[model samples]
Target: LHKEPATLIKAIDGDTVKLMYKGQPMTFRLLLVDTPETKHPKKGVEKYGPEASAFTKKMIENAKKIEVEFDKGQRTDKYGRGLAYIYADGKMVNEALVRQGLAKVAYVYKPNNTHEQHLRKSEAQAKKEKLNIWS
Candidate 1:
């Protein structure tokens, strides 16, 4: 990709983004974290669901440019979203979401070896603050 926009179109769930990248529409799975599963309504809602989604939307909507980092792993889930660590002006957006207690570090399936330490810190802070999806 030669040029990228700083502003985002919309926020998917908490951290994910659906936008144009390199002349094609792309959905990015914000790395290092996961939000309450808005994808599954029957599964029941996660605590702070609305807050998380709203926080993410505000962040991305205000950013002038988004930074994307790629790695080797399941790039796409069954739905085909580009899994990546998204940042804005050097701040890790995924981590920020969790740090702010908007989401949780989803360290399930594939672990993030590269940014695990930072993600851990973010999660810890979230837990410490009791943003427990309940907060």
Candidate 2:
């Protein structure tokens, strides 16, 4: 539940980002939000993948600052990428992605699902409105 200042150096796709944490490079796979696949080595580009990627890119690009927050449990995923909740310009980037219909609630692991309720609500609202990827 502590926050650490970070710089978002790159958006790997929609849900993944590369950043500088404590002066060291780190990769984070956004926690509680999953976006369409733009580049899966085997899956290729999925529907709305590019749009999702573009959305995340624009969001990160316009942000004045970015911070990374870790959960109470595991800090990284199976792939060794850090799992985190990102805040940009004082807004929860993960929630924004879901609310804007660019992503969905996913990877609901226990003790790490701090924002699951809000994210689920946003996803439901997006689905109801048929916005962006939801459509």
Candidate 3:
């Protein structure tokens, strides 16, 4: 798959971000993983949600080089956001979050499950270690 370089406008949440792609600003919902919601229209904040968002923001806030890759399946849902894999300084941000127990593998749609096993492996490790959200 080809990766497109982009600059982050901001982190919308742990699992979403806004970036400038092709000179146009767009919002992207991270693929293959889900983080606890830190910002919801209604509901009390879940435990560790803030921490997850903070970690996510910190990773890309000042990243020297950020890129996004599209999947083979549907690129976006009805939300009109891009669904993609994100990288920062060459690190897979989606994998990092699961490995760190800040997010969980989810939304495993056909053909788009490019890193499903990888994400599950990280989640298993996190669960074994009882880290953060997995605790």
Candidate 4:
């Protein structure tokens, strides 16, 4: 796992965010987690999308520090957004979102996944709890 210091500039949605790394702006799409669509020009807003976005915004806003961790294999997604595990407030932001039931584990499972087991467990717990999006 490779990591770089980052500053949260803004939350694009629940799963996407803009950050400043080394004084350069970058867009990151949270790896292994998918949040509801809050801004799809065609699909429009999905249920609970706004809540998820708000949750993400609040979390990032309150974070004292942020770091972007890149995977060993893939660095960015096809959309050109950097794929990463965001660390904030001494916790993995991606897992936090999943554990909180604001997002779900994505279908990007691979052998190189470092946090696969933990992320799956978080999702299962969220489902069992029927929290937010899991409801």
Candidate 5:
């Protein structure tokens, strides 16, 4: 929500980002989703884990403005941080990642789901495409 065109500073993993806007640092969690942890690896390493992250980094490597949308629900989790649905060039990055099989919907928090169908389809396609995680 900082830049006008959105920009990506760095990728933390498959579904998280370290971004900057207005000369300030912002943290982003892919909306309605979760992904394998790169900081601390998870069980079976999750499918397409690394490629997901790499893809995200490539997508926003030069982003300057990040548009954010939130579904009707509590913003942020229990951590008092803002939860956001991020976008660049009108493209929803959260949904893009899941649809690309880079992330998974955190359905336990379904009230905040915005890209549910897209996410599912994306995973199915990824599995079909034999992305790293699916294979």
Candidate 6:
């Protein structure tokens, strides 16, 4: 939809979050990336999970404003969470996390992959820069 003006409700983890968008509460799975697991009881926090979670939380908390943008294809995930790109003050959160080495570009479904290339480029650069998980 390319809309703006959303207020973050919660940063559930690096790639999962909740926000108020379009006059309703929307939880997101964050398209095109998968951050390490942080809240799984069985998993008990993966190696880089904490860092990814903290990075995501801080970014959302500090943003002056945020927005959610849907892909050309799918709008929601199997979990029914919004599957879209998150924008914080003109910055794309999906790519930011990938670029920071907090996540891996993943779960890319067909035509909905409109912005997958952007995430890939960031992933490429992050791998080269050897940041966080990349390191």
69-106: candidate 4 lDDT, tens digit per residue: 88876777788888889998668889988998989898
* Clash pairs, model 6 backbone: none
**lDDT tens per residue, model 5, 12-35:** 776777766447676766676777
Tell me the spans in candidate 2 whose CA falls farther than 4 Å from its real position. Answer: none
The stretch of ten residues in a row with the least summed lDDT in candidate 6 is: 1-10
Candidate with the larger TM-score of 1 and 2: 2
Query: Which candidate achieves the best TM-score against the true structure?
Result: 3
Worst 10 residues of 2 by lDDT: 52-61
Report clash pairs, candidate 3.
none
- Please tell me which model should have the higher TM-score, number 3 or number 5: 3
All candidates' TM-scores?
0.81, 0.94, 0.95, 0.93, 0.72, 0.92
Candidate 3 Cα deviation (angstroms), residue 67: 0.3
Candidate 5, TM-score vs. the true structure?
Answer: 0.72
lDDT of 2 by residue, 20-132 (tens): 99998999998988788988878989888898888778888788888899988899878889999988887888998899898889868899988889889989999999998
Q: Is 3 or 6 the stronger prediction by lDDT? A: 3
Clashing residue pairs in candidate 1, if any? Answer: 6-64, 6-65
Q: Which runs of model 3 end up more than 4 angstroms from their true locations? A: none
Best by lDDT: 3
Please give, for residues 15-119, the per-residue lDDT of candidate 3 as tens digits.
899999999999999999988887865765777889889988999996899999999888887989999999999999999999999999996789999889988
* Model 5 ranges with Cα > 4 A deviation: 1-9, 20-24, 41-48
Tens digit per residue, CA lDDT, model 6, 20-96? 87889988888889899888658879989998998888988999988888888878867789888888888888899
Candidate 3's error at 48, in angstroms? 1.0
The residue-by-residue lDDT of candidate 1 on 45-114, one tens digit each, is 5667777787777777777777677655665667788777776766777788878877766765544346
Candidate 2 residue-wise lDDT at 42: 81
Judged by whole-model lDDT over C-alpha atoms, candidate 2 comes out at 0.87
